[PDB]
Amino acid sequence: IYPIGTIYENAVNPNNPVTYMGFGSWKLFGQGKVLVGWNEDISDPNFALNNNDLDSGGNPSHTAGGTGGSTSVTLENANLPATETDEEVLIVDENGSVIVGGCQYDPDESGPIYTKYREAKASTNSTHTPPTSITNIQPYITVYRWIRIA
Amino acid sequence: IYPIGTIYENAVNPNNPVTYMGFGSWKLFGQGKVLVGWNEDISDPNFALNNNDLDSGGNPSHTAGGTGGSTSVTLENANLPATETDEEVLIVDENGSVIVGGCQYDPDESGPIYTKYREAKASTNSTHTPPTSITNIQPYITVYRWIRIA
Amino acid sequence: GGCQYDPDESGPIYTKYREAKASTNSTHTPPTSITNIQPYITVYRWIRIA
Amino acid sequence: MFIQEPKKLIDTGEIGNASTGDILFDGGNKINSDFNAIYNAFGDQRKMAVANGTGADGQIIHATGYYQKHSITEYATPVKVGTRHDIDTSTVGVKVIIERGELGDCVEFINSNGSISVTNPLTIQAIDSIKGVSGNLVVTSPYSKVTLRCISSDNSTSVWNYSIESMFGQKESPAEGTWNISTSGSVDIPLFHRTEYNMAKLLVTCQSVDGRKIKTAEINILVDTVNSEVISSEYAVMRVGNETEEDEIANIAFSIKENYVTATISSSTVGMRAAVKVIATQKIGVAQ
Amino acid sequence: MFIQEPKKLIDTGEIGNASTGDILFDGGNKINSDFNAIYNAFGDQRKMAVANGTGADGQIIHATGYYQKHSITEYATPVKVGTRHDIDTSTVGVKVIIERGELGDCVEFINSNGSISVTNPLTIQAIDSIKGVSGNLVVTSPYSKVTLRCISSDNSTSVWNYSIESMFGQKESPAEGTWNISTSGSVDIPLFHRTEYNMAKLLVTCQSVDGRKIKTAEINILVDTVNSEVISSEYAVMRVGNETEEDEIANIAFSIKENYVTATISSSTVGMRAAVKVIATQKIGVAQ
Amino acid sequence: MFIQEPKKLIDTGEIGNASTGDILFDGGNKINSDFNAIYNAFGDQRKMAVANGTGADGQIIHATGYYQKHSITEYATPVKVGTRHDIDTSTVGVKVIIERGELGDCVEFINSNGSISVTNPLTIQAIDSIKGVSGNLVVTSPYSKVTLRCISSDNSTSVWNYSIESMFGQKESPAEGTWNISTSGSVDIPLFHRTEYNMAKLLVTCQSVDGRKIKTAEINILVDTVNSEVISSEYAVMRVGNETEEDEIANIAFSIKENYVTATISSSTVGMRAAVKVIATQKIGVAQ
Amino acid sequence: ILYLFERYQPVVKVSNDKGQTWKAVKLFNDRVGYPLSKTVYYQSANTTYVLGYDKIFYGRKLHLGFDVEIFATYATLPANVYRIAEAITCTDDYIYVVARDKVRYIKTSNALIDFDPLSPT
To answer: What does this protein do (chain G)?
Structure first.
């Protein structure tokens, strides 16, 4: 029923199964790790090969036991879709149609002040460095996972 | 073989296990919930301490049963990495250039050889309030999951 | 709106703009995707089919 | 990388029955953009920073096509399939990240100067998979040719088997063919013009009309230049319908005839199919 | 298969001196059809059943070109030369019947998923002949590439020699070149980065400046990973200007130097041209 | 050779706000010329002497592209890169003089009928250099393919490495792959459909999971048709982690299973990576 | 349409009909400039070629509703005279402009000559 390699789950019992089962050499396992079907395929970027079992060439074996996964994620630029302002803005342009820069005042100060607009991008959220992360964790529950080592 | 608190899962059978098994007091369990190894290392933020079992001071018991996680995620500003326009533009600007109308343009012609502008912080997706969420759910299958209450 | 100054300035500074909404990450097409997968390990799962 | 739109076609229900200029004002936008992809495909997209592919300096079509050279910043984005690229990693090793493709989707790439090394490797992400390649394939080969082909797309699964080839070299076989050993029991086959190779290696298979007697040997030859000869080494002999452990099912003789290396394949057995195939050759050029 | 017309060009003697709309109403018909061939060539002609190659979903140009996928019903008609096709015979073996071609006429075809088998063969009729092929050639090869080229057209005779290639694999040679054995009588040649191959096979030919002494051996090497060595097997030795049955005209030594498999070719004879050519290699990847 | 201009694009600021005919009268000149390059690329430029690529006889696009055939008088001028040419030197040996190219510049050429010989050689000048070629390369090969690629342009220096390939033949490998020797210590691998080859040659490398034990042998096989067998010759044996001079690190056995030549590779050692690679094959067709 | 314009300001009073009611538009980029002789434009074939204080607008013919001209610059021609160059002559295939004795001409087909990275553009 529980051959070597068997994952047992009891929920409310912290104890070693051999305590409550009276059997087996039991070891906690996969903690904070979900259990997903390891794909027999070599196709799956995830469940095909085992990250942990690598060869001399660092190549993952075709096996279960691959590990990974992330609880949360922070956003970076490359992930952000093309976006734009929601109104038109005066756009620094070499060849453009909006001509400007001709008028005196300067000294002479007697010339009244036209507001002098310069030339670069406007940063957005320059204070998030990095920004707040988002969690990757879907609804769950914590459970006492027991693999029988022997 | 099924001590109380054992998590059983039959794939297709909706029935109480005691129906097809003949034994046990079974409760449906972990619906819309993934089972994830609970850690005896308290450092696991989710899966070590049990959120639902708290002490009087609300310290989560270090026990299985910690729950949490979200099916989908709506993005927010705090998550946004440093960003700026894909072009150069005017961001008032101070020092700069921009002009008023020598010949000091007054009435008709009104619109032409004249441009009305305003200054403020340029909105993007201002109408996303909130924006649309992204799902946090990874590939799954719904299953009948029975915990044995007795 | 423009002066032109007058003729004969050493300051004939001119920039010619265009007016449009200002794009961002136009090079992200689509943006770089983000993974949805939380911590795990791979196992051999079996259904008893009989 | 100058971005292309797909084909964008004009309405003829427009024009003579509608406002001429407008419907045309639109059409040019198509046409202009339309040729852009064309010339951007077969010419440098860095010619758009030029007169936008216009003028004599403008993008030209290459019947051979053009392998588009760019910065890494552009390949820092998943690069679409169907594209020919030329990038030289002498500056640094790069990843070329590729979109999830479709069955049949190709990605052609080269390093012309062959700057690719281990010091100048080349990483590639074609989304969700590349057949035979766990994770991202790295390419250290100078004068290699990166050709990806997506052999499965399906739903999410872009499966890219992978071909790569040295952009240069002598890849030809001077002599390959098949014939039947004559009623005379032999023939003379010009192999290559006697000057074409200092070394060659070929494989002859002499098989009976009914296929029961089939002769095979491992042919290694040294072309003798001064003597106008060819020196052979035969070994690893294999047979099927051999009736004798001696020369059997046929015989293999060599010569240089008519400025051709000429093999003379003699079979005592009539009706013997002999396929002459030169698998590998060698010739000496200049030093360096 | 979306049918293309040939190039169809506009009259400029029209337009400003004639009725604008009409002469243009005609021109679009050209232009529209004109780009169609273009995009139908380099994109899926099944995108015509779409918005007719228009829109973002519309046919796009592939600098690599596109191998047109279709039903068999369409290939049930002689298919024109110059076309790139991708068909997968998993459904069934097909005949691809081809028109009588012209000298130089090409037909490119592939099975991307490699579904081609004996259970999924591929028959071809190129009219009146295919060189080397009596009747219709059948193709059982997965991940093959069907390339026909009409090497004679003449009057009635469309002669198609035939090339076919595995769409994938490692086809490169790590080291091929030629040099002259130094006044030192030897050198060290980086062959490949020591990690690139578990096995390689090369052919060196050491020939005197006057060509009279030319050395040849059959080089089979086992790259030793852990020991950073390379194990050789030499045999089938052949010579011309050999003055001694011992090592003569040159010597062949091996090593791994600078993360390169490094052959050290030593000749007591000065002025010896040695062409180093690696004919075949092998490396081990992941299982499956 | 019909000369092409580069891309030449229309002004849309014209048209509806300007004189319609004129701005269009210009645009056609572009468009007409614009498609010309296109069709001249993928179709015979000698179709311009025809209705100028117009009509059903007009230049058509070849998804395969067209190798432009011409007189020598035209190639008597430096011929631009990017072009596909087909010329047959049966008339005479020719020089094809090529402009100074750019890094990445390609020149594709073929002789379809293979008339190229020593009596029909082919000379090439690509300006200032061709890598590996001192002076002008000559080509005597029938059914060859002339492909130049300019691997350095720099300032004055157009460096052309050179690739050439037989336009035809059987270039495929029936079986190439890699696997790990099973807990059973062996497997059976279909190599090719038993009928595909009379001869094959492959290379298997059996390497331990930790890479210390790696097995190599030289595999020469004779497919036995009547007996449905395959006869092997193994020699030049090489090892690394061999613990015994006998069969070690693995074993190599053969068979024909499921209409497949089937090699059975048995290793007493578990966790042995075996890469099965068929380097060369042979089959017999018809005489002549 | 009649086209009425100040010499320096790229500001164009338009007159559709024998002068009664007019409008103006910017319609010109930059500094329509300083012709001597009060002849700004020469129409050569389809192209109305006008001066600009810095530049040369090329002839090629909005919410007002009736068609007009809008000229971008053929380029900013002037070599080393920059401004002045009082006179503007475009014969077919030739622009001709002169300050003082130097006449400096351009070949206008599709412009025979363009400029590259060296600064200005």
So the answer is: Intermediate/inner baseplate protein. The gp25-(gp6)2-gp7 module is involved in sheath contraction. Involved in the tail assembly.
Distance CA A27, CA A9 (A): 11
Q: Contact F226/D241, CB-based, under 8 Å?
A: yes
Q: Which residues of D touch C28 (CB under 8 A)?
A: 77
Which residues, listed in sequence order, are joined to residue E257 by a DSSP beta bridge?
Answer: E260
Q: Are E233 and E220 a contacting pair, CB within 8 Å?
A: yes
Q: Which helix (H) or strand (E) holds A41?
A: none
Are residues G61 and F16 in contact, defined by beta-carbon separation less than 8 angstroms? no
State the DSSP string of chain G: -EEEE-SSSS-EEEE-SSSSSEEEE--B-S-----STT---EEETTEEEEE-SS-EEPP---TT-S----B-EEE---SS--S---EEEEETTEEEEEETTEEEEE-TTTTS----SSS--
D77 and C CB contact within 8 Å = yes
Residue D7's DSSP bridge partners are none
Dihedral angle sign, alpha carbons of residues B30, B36, B39, B45: negative
Q: Do F95 and F67 touch, CB atoms closer than 8 A?
A: no
- Four-point Cα dihedral E126, E128, E129, E135, nearest 10: 80
CB < 8 Å from F in window 32-71 of D:
32, 35-36, 38-39, 42-43, 47, 52-67, 69
Q: Which tokens belong to A21?
A: 């089962």
Is residue F153 a contact partner of residue F100, using CB atoms and an 8 Å limit? yes
Contact (CB<8Å) C12/G54: yes
Task: Determine the Cα–Cα distance for residues F113 and F167; give it in Å rounded to an integer.
Answer: 10
Chain C and chain E touch, per 3+ beta carbon pairs within 8 A: no
G121 and D CB contact within 8 Å: no
Angstrom distances, CA of residue G94 to CA of E64, F200, G106: 43, 73, 5
- Structure tokens belonging to residue B146: 């029975």
Task: Say if CB F173 and CB E166 are below 8 A apart.
Answer: yes
Question: Which CATH number is correct for D170-283, 2.60.40.1680, 3.40.720.10, 1.10.630.10, 2.40.160.20?
Answer: 2.60.40.1680
Q: Which chains touch F (3 or more CB pairs under 8 A)?
A: A, D, E, G
Q: From the centroid of its chain, how far is CA A149?
A: 33
Given the DSSP bridges, would you call strands D260-266 and E84-86 parallel, antiparallel or unpaired?
unpaired
Resolution in A: 6.8
CA-based nearest distance B56→chain C, Å:
31
Residue type, A91: I
Helix axis angle for E20-42 and D20-42, nearest 10°, is 30
Residue F220 vs residues D238, F172, F204, F285, G106: alpha-carbon distances, Å: 9, 17, 11, 20, 75
Yes or no: say if F164 and F143 are a contact pair by the CB < 8 Å rule. no
Helix (H/G/I), strand (E/B), else coil: E281: strand
Tokens of E157: 């005779």
Provide the residue ranges of all domains of chain D, joining segments of one domain with +: 17-51, 67-169, 170-283
**Strand pairing report for F106-110 and E251-253:** unpaired
Cα(D226)–Cα(E282) distance, integer angstroms: 36
Cα–Cα distances (Å) from E149 to D87, E129, F111, F113, in that order, read: 31, 11, 11, 9
DSSP letters spanning F189-237:
EEEEETTS-SEEEEEEEEEETTSSSEEEEEEEEEEETTTTEEEEEEEEE
Reading the block at residue F96, the tokens are: 């094809």
Distance CA F6, CA D61 (A): 7
- Determine contact, residues E175/E276, Cβ cutoff 8 Å: yes
CA–CA separation, A15 and A26 (whole Å): 10
Instruction: Check for a shared fold between F67-169 and F170-283.
Output: no
Instruction: Give the class (CATH, top level) of D17-51.
Output: mainly alpha
Encoded tokens for F184: 């059973």
Contacts of B8 (CB under 8 A, 6+ apart): B2, B17, B26, B145, B146, B147, B148
Q: Which fold has domain D67-169?
A: Jelly Rolls (2.60.120)
